[PDB]
């Protein structure tokens, strides 16, 4: 179905920006780590006060970032914050992309951000919406 | 490539259990916790002593597992046991299984075991390898 493949976009598929958590820069980790584990999200966009993307954070990124030589140093987390361990090289696609260029990016990012013409956080696109839609149609 | 399809087993598509890390029901939640951040697994296979699967343990099964009201409370982790959050009720799917079954079943587990005849550990099944695949074919 090369007309459905071709008429899905970016937002079709995405999970809407006001079902995903998210931070600010200066957020601290211990407020980030409970926002992340709450939410059960692996990882929540970084947002600033007019909703633009900055970055994406996730336990992943936190966890690495107290990682002693013999201990997740867990008690560093109250004196940092998320602008320190965060990601701002991150996968982002536009709500008109096509289900090409998603299917694509997802392959090496499990999660990817989408933002309108101007960079206002609009959802987030997982593999599994790429990987349902794949597995009916083939 | 039908062919292709019907020939590709779980065991072409998956990440041999001598490249995952493993930890045993018995383990206290610091070590599992540190296994697993130092892996840079999301999530690892419980074994027993003959290399059989028990379950499955991950980054967010610790973390809720010491979800406090106000703060992640990461004291506890050393009073804890991996038996405490595991998932017994885990995806696991044969070394011959088709490429089909691993499709549909990655739809919902974005990581499943591969287990031989007699429940040997053989390695683990990953979302990127079924898009992988999927993504130059179509």
Chains 1, 2 share one sequence.
Request: proline share 4%; hydrophobic share 45%.
């Amino acid at each position: 179905p090369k007309d459905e493949f071709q008429q899905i976009f970016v937002k079709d598929l995405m999970i809407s920006s006001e079902k995903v958590a998210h931070v600010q820069i200066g957020n601290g980790l211990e407020h980030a780590l409970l926002v992340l584990v709450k939410s059960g999200y692996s990882a929540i966009p970084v947002l600033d006060p007019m909703y633009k993307l900055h970055g994406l954070i996730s336990t992943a990124m936190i966890l690495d970032g107290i990682l002693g030589l013999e201990r997740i140093e867990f008690e560093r987390l109250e004196e940092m914050k998320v602008e320190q361990v965060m990601k701002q090289d991150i996968p982002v696609l536009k709500l008109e992309d096509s289900f090409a260029k998603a299917l694509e990016m997802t392959i090496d990012h499990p999660f990817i951000c989408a933002v309108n013409e101007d960079g206002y956080f609009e959802g987030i696109l997982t593999r599994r919406a790429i990987l349902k839609l794949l597995n009916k149609k083939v």
